[PDB]
Symmetry: C2
Subunit: 344 residues, 2 copies
């Protein structure tokens, strides 16, 4: 088994037991935009306004949410892994972007998709999150049961061999990231975490009992265009031209929006139907008779047409850079992608 090795980097507990914070995403984008050394400077804890271990966590979460890519010097400098903002970060978090203050719940659903997402050249930095949402056998678990599940997947997927204590720390942090704070004990310490608003995870049988579970209701906070974006972005993992993808695969394949968002096939179809009605190039077709999503040109570009429309077409704004503008401004983003590729 190497579903996981093919989708995720070997990366555990680099969040340093810290769940994401809005202030960290915001401040990381602002500093890194003009300073590649913003996380590595001896200056960082005061320049970022956080403790020293929070600097690394900030750096990790930037990487994990696909808001930055890392690559060496030179100009020398060193082997130092400097950070570079992605075009998606410029699109989302810029003061001129889609949702710089994460006012819309669809933006959190989007960031959640990027944390789990993977494609050739760009794997996930949260293998424990990927196992939990895409590969775990059961919806209810103890933290030690889920920990054991990830250990077994890491053992069959990576040459290194599992660090149980680090994987246990991922499981603590998943819990803090998705579960309501009333189901947490803080020895006051308790921090906000905006991904709790997604309602993806709950305590069970609350003593609080030792068990936790992922939910399975409807997702009124998940916008249709966010589902449609993820389905077309998932289709674009393997195709760059016109074509189709079955709804069954979108609902059930590991990596796809059904498991990422924990939504049923019917909720995917309902989102795609609503979005298709506004986009001539997209249709739901019932074949033999299973439903398929069709697209008359490459699905990556249509994905971003649907996503940009959810935020009133950010790419139309004055002086908004194109991906090709961004790539020339930050050529190391492509170089980081290439070195991921030349392992395949």
């Amino acid at each position: 088994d190497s579903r996981l090795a093919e989708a995720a980097h070997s990366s555990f507990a680099r969040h340093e037991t810290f769940a994401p914070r809005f202030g960290w995403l915001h401040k990381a984008y602002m500093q890194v935009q003009s300073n590649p050394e913003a996380f590595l400077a001896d200056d960082a804890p005061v320049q970022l306004g956080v403790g020293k271990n929070m600097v690394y966590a900030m750096r990790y979460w930037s990487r994990a949410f696909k808001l930055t890519r890392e690559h060496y010097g030179d100009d020398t400098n060193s082997r130092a892994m400097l950070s570079y903002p992605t075009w998606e970060a410029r699109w989302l978090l810029d003061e001129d972007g889609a949702d710089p203050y994460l006012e819309e719940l669809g933006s959190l659903w989007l960031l959640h998709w990027w944390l789990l997402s993977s494609r050739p050249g760009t794997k996930s930095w949260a293998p424990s999150w990927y196992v939990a949402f895409h590969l775990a056998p059961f919806s209810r678990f103890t933290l030690a049961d889920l920990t054991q599940v990830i250990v077994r997947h890491v053992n069959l997927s990576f040459p290194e061999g599992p660090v149980e204590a680090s994987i246990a720390k991922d499981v603590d942090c998943i819990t803090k990231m998705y579960v309501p704070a009333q189901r947490l004990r803080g020895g006051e310490d308790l921090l906000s975490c905006p991904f709790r608003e997604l309602g993806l995870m709950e305590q069970v049988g609350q003593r609080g009992s030792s068990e936790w579970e992922f939910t399975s209701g409807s997702r009124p906070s998940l916008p249709a265009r966010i589902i449609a974006y993820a389905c077309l972005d998932y289709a674009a993992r393997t195709t760059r031209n016109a074509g189709s993808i079955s709804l069954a695969r979108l609902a059930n394949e590991p990596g796809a929006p059904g498991r990422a968002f924990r939504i049923r096939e019917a909720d995917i179809a309902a989102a795609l139907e609503k979005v298709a009605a506004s986009h001539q190039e997209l249709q739901l077709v019932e074949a033999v008779g299973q439903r398929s999503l069709t697209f008359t040109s490459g699905p990556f570009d249509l994905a971003w047409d649907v996503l940009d429309e959810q935020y009133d077409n950010v790419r139309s704004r004055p002086n908004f850079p194109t991906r090709e503008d961004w790539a020339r401004r930050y050529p190391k983003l492509a170089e980081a992608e290439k070195r991921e590729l030349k392992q395949l």
Copy 2:
């Protein structure tokens, strides 16, 4: 039944049913700091980064959370109410301040207290919230129930009166502010609201059914210094000298922390023990045999010692302004307070 009139201004539905947004608090502070006309300018939507239909909601929430005050400018033959940031906003929301990005849940508890709080010279801007937390005789309700208890309290307090439709909009907004996003139904519509993390309101018994309730469990996200601040801030409403206030009043009196935070007397007692252990001027006393909190000096200054401690003593940082420094930069803050105090005929 003048309780609501003494506690709250006659202000209903000015938020247009938009629940608070962190970006709204943060950007309004960044702009009002240097521009008293931030909410009135032709270019407000672009400079505040919001739609034209959101500017007033944003202006309202800043005032309601005691983050701004409003007063006429120095501009003759003009009645427009200009905005000025409060010292509390400088302490909390500045990049140099306590929690500019609302990273700690105690900051949301605190903002919630500010929304509900009331003092001679600074009443609440959220009468429907005041009624819902402090005056309603029940805790479980349909939205039509909550609307009608507010309507009943408003007719006793404000002759002028909003229309019922305005109060209903307040109640929709109360719901979206506090209940989990999974209980709401949009058109996509749903916005984040960080006050939902406080776990204060939940859907109950549904189907159908149409019921809601304020919750009543334990509050592990409510820090003890936040409780003690509110208790001392509450005592300071009526006294500026050494004195005392009973735990029963703190836990049960309308306007006090027990009803604002929906916590029981023992939870208040436990928070106050923790804080009195580091504060020799605070004590929990047994009298006959009711417990009281006592303070050997003025409660308001002790309140802010306790609150500033929760955030690592922000007032000690280099160049942090005193309230005297701030009142000289923004003289109309005191003018807006004096205006309201002389409405207390």
